Design a protein around this ligand. Sequence first.
Ligand SMILES: [Ca+2]
Ligand SMILES: [Ca+2]
Length: 291
Amino acid sequence: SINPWFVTGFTDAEGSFMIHLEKNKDKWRVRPTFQIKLDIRDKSLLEEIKNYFNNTGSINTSNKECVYKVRSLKDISIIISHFDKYNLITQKKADFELFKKIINKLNSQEHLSYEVGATVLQEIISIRASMNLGLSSSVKEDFPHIIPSNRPLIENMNIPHPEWMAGFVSGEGSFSVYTTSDDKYVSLSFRVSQHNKDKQLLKSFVDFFGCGGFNYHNKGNKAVIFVTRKFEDINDKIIPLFNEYKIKGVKYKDFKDWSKVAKMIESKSHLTTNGYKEICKIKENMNSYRK
DNA sequence: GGATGGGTACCATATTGGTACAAAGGG
DNA sequence: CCTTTGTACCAATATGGTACCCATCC
Ligand SMILES: [Ca+2]
Ligand SMILES: [Ca+2]
């Protein structure tokens, strides 16, 4: 019984709305897809999303990865109606919304293969142009025409429900325990990172938690980070929030472990060597180091 | 025959997510 | 003086994207 706002936040973080164009004799097939992909560690959270959407689509699994793909046109409408009731708020909103347009053109034609007779098709290709990466260079072989405007959405970014934040953070959050090189101090941090595109949304997080700060990820300012470090702030605001809007997936355990350490810091155990050794043990088994 | 579904191979970079310390700052 | 905090550093892979083939169905 997982929250629709959760689902949206998660697909604001992972999640794609794609239209692919596939040539086949004189005709081009228009293949749409909506996709979440993750590392196989978190297959279970994908199983859960998939049930949220009745049981549309199919999960696929290789060595390291797993993929949820919903490609069929009947299946895709269930999805659209969710995201219409529960709007994305990252730039991904604009790729979803081009995707809707294309879907509508296709429903109004009750088919998905087109003769280069490019009305319906040229429109689709113009739309598809300003979407994700955009045109294959072999669709640029067959078409030199123009691209429609991509809806802006820049202030259009108030966080809609805390649960959004829990799906999103379950996606792009990290829960980290720092130790000094001396091996004498220990500290926590909560970080959520994102492309420049959505700089404006991330800074809005500082309001959402009433703590932390916003900085740059890397010198070539291509990337941004929301970070909290003050233990005051982590123990009062960040932890209690997420106890009430649960994080889902493997990250949930990273959260439990993190907030286990948070407790030993509260009670000052981190300044005793047994506390310190104990924390270190928890650290060696969280995040990418788990199992 | 032609159109569609769907499995799986492949591609690129934005997250993934770890380490480090000088400058607080206060009891 | 001692410990916390903000800010920086950054290698690379878990994300986010895309193309091809064919075997059933219309
Ligand atoms: Ca993302
Ligand atoms: Ca993730």
